[PDB]
Ligand binder design. Sequence first.
Ligand code: K
Ligand code: K
Ligand code: MG
Ligand code: MG
Ligand code: MG
Ligand code: MG
Ligand code: MG
Ligand code: MG
Ligand code: MG
Ligand code: MG
Ligand code: MG
Ligand code: MG
Lengths: 353, 158, 98, 193, 52
Amino acid sequence: TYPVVSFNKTSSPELKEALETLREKVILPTYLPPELRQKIFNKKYEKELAHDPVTIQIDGQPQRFSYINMLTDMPNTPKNIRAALLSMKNGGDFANLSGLLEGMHRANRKLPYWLSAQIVRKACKAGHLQLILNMVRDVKRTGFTLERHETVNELLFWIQRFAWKSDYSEPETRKALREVQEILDALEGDERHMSKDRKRQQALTRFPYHRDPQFLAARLNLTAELAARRATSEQQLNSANDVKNLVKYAEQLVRLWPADKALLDMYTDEAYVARVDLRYLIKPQVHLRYASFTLQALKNAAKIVGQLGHGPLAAQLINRAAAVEAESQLAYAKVDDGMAGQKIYEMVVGGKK
Amino acid sequence: AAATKVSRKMFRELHGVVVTSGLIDKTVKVRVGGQKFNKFLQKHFDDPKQYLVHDPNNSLRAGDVVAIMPGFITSKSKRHVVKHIIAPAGTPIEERPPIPSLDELWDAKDAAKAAKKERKVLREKMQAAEEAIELAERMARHAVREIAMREKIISLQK
Amino acid sequence: VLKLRLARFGRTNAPFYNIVVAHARTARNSKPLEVIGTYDPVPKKDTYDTTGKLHKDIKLDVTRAKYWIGVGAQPTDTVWRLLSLVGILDPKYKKPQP
Amino acid sequence: LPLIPKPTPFVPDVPTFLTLIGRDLKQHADKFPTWEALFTLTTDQLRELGVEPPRARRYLLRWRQRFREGKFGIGGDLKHVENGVAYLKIHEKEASPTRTSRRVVNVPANQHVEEVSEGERVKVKGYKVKGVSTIVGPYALPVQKGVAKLAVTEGMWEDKRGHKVDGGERRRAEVRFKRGVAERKALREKMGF
Amino acid sequence: SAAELAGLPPKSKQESWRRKMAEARRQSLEAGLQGLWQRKVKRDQKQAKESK
RNA sequence: GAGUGCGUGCAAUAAGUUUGCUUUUCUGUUAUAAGUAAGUAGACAUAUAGGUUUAGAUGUUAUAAUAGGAUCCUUCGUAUG
RNA sequence: GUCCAAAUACUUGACACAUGCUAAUCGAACGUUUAAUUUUGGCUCUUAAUUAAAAGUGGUGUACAGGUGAGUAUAAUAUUUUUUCGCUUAACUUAAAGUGAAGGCAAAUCCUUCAUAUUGCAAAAGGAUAUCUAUAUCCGCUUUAAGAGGAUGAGAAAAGUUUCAGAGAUAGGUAGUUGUUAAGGUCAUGGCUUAACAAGCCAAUAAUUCUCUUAGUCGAAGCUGAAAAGGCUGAUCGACCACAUUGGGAAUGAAAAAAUCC
Ligand SMILES: [K+]
Ligand SMILES: [K+]
Ligand SMILES: [Mg+2]
Ligand SMILES: [Mg+2]
Ligand SMILES: [Mg+2]
Ligand SMILES: [Mg+2]
Ligand SMILES: [Mg+2]
Ligand SMILES: [Mg+2]
Ligand SMILES: [Mg+2]
Ligand SMILES: [Mg+2]
Ligand SMILES: [Mg+2]
Ligand SMILES: [Mg+2]
């Protein structure tokens, strides 16, 4: 079906070593049939393998497989992945994740729940948002499921930042608004993103990921940054069409989001307890991270919706903003000087850069 | 309720003559009279038959006339029993071990059969109690490891 | 699978059916378990009747057929209709009114 | 006695009806001068017109009687058909504050779903929405995100006659082996030598 | 069925069919058995009566 | 002298095949051993972070005993002489 | 030798066979490919899909139906009548309960295993269609209790029946073989099984074994006689047995009951 996983672009020598180890001992054996794979991990066939090593046609020249001590020879997959991931400072360095995560999916390697949230951060802080979105769309091969509530909260954050980067320019904002809709449709329609872990996180929040106020505020942010610019017939039709979504999403978020409830109180009190689900929000450094854009969204949406003559929505949106702004200020007095949280919030809400 | 008593049904009585005796314990060959009808010749022919009759107390000598009854199964080839002696041969009837009545013979089967079930119920219970103690011992070694490992965690949370 | 079905007997252009109780996977005209009744497809006409009506002669043992139906016997389409007319079962097909 | 059913938008004329049931029945389209001749002609009259073999005739009488009862095939309900083509669109709703009920409706190609009334917004039976924007259903070619169309294809409603794959179960081996001897000849004799 | 002894209506179209068919097999067995039993009794009496 | 769709003895023998003082091998429980590969648990800390660290309760790997099933050989065994 | 209807129609070489046909079916079990159609990403190449055809993987059925009479010489764990019983996880009826979790193949209702299933052994599989401004059905799957059916257990006991080809030779056959004691097994009975003793059991007119010749068996089924427990045949009809070029074999399955398979 798909081409054999391969890594042929490495800037550093440590990167290649980490991948070649995982590739030739954890990924390559998965391309073998079931029978021949129960031989490499046996001692009774060690002597036979040395005489006739197994071969597999991998892009021409066949491969070779000798005895592999399951306990000793096998490498630590989590550690290596971390080493390989940390040593990535190039476009081609991050292009190997599609193959790396694909190999682990073939080996049935239960990866850390938080790994998906980490790969999104490091890969997005270098300018490779597409590589992550390409894997999220190609979830049948890479296995980049949107299981964790954090991963979706980390993905939408960078999506907005890339649009907020260039002062919410219409060309990128239009493209960025498509990425959010691409995800909200995947979480809802696609089934590959649904797992037992996600069911537990939805039962604790009582909101499905596609109807979660925290994630629905990102779509209302870009939608509010489009009507602002305009509120040339072809472009005038888009503006009038963006005002309908704004009023629609503005009236859809107010219903879900209760009255005067901040981020740390929106969900049930039993969601923040467990560390495997929705505990990152507790820390002040991480709350301001996902509370900056969502806060500015309400402020920017309450204004425009107020110019069109919608009293109720104005007060409603301001209600949430007032409750979120207060909580945000609280965490701003505890975040240690130098943390990314304090910086991001200061540059977005503080308008200082 | 758990014991199956014998049928204890009476059957026809046949008068025969002991042919052989003393060759095997509690068994004699008696010769009875019969008749078979030839359909082609429309004529009855004498069809005498010889069976192996069960002699419980070995009270029959070759030559005497006896009365036998069928339906009493004691062996593979034996389905007849001695009801009484018509005419003795050699010695009087009063000089031979008495012939047990059919009731006495049947009672032996029931008593022997009932005793057999008593042995089974004991063997089944003992075998079950002997296997439930080995299955309860696995729980012991398995329950201590769990409690020894589960309480370790419980103590690191207070 | 006990089945209430028709065994075709007669000559060319003279069909005469015989209601039987036989196992599904058996020859059509093999000796069945029971012969409930007989069926004549060609409709007859009363001897001294000039009106023009027609009828079909069917000799059926209702009592015996009922027992077999109660133990899981599966009558065929043709026999099911006949039983419906007598009122033992509900019609398997009905004319559309619209 | 032989009541005639009014033509349906998806089946305006006879050529369409005969084209949907396939089985190469569009050869006798000219035999029927009007739409009432199809539903008025009898077996004997279909035998003289030239409707043969008997399998095609009995098959037509069946679909005929099946049309009077409104047991239409795929696309029968459709009301907004245009020159043999219809368009499907997704009609979103709100069953709850966190769910959404999507239904495959049939509306004019130009109009929008939200620009139609309840009476003019039919729900095509047999077509379901899988995911947030995919219309899934037999003979549903996609045009845009959330838009599909049904072209009137020959054999739309036909009941395919089972065809033996390769000579059948009894003769499968012979046909394959006998065809394997005709291949090794071209490879060796006609081409090799 | 338990749902039929509690006075509950049929769940759907098919349930109505099964209820009717199963009931047709219930009255067909009762009449069949009782009907055939009378035949036997009526037959045995004739033999005994005519044999005595 | 010629033939033989016949019986039978011996030798031989494909498929198949009784038995185990056979030849490998998988699985199942039972008891141990390991915690490095995996997987499942708990403890501590970090922050554009997600690291350190111990543990076997399910399960994973290793050995032992034991049960069963495939293989190899053995015996019987068409053709054939 | 004018016509019509019905019913019969290789009785011989089970000799050799050209050609087309006699068992397939389900897309509401499952994905694979190929085409178009619509989309992503990068600037034709490349993702994610829909649809339609073509080959398959699966489930069920080819254990029914139809054909032939080569081989086959029988009394046998064969058969009735009454009494008493046993087994049956597939299909057919009625009802109840349960339908969760992983791995392997491209995927699966295919394979492998796990949790739970009155105590403890011992299960399963998912697919499809509607309603609302998640819920309820549909077709299945597993287990359990019964009815029916069954090709079922050596069923058992009592009393009976079964016209068994023709010719020739053979006086021994039987070794758990016959019986007793004890125990197990069984619904029950039976060397059914085992231990220990005893030397029995069947038969003498052929029990038993052997060779030759011939044959599918049977029925008011066909023909025939006034009739005989009539005679002959063993076509079409029904039942039973055997076989599918000849010979030698096993598995699958509820059950070989195949024109299968080796
Ligand atoms: K030999
Ligand atoms: K023959
Ligand atoms: Mg040899
Ligand atoms: Mg380790
Ligand atoms: Mg030989
Ligand atoms: Mg012939
Ligand atoms: Mg057959
Ligand atoms: Mg399930
Ligand atoms: Mg009598
Ligand atoms: Mg014996
Ligand atoms: Mg012959
Ligand atoms: Mg014959």
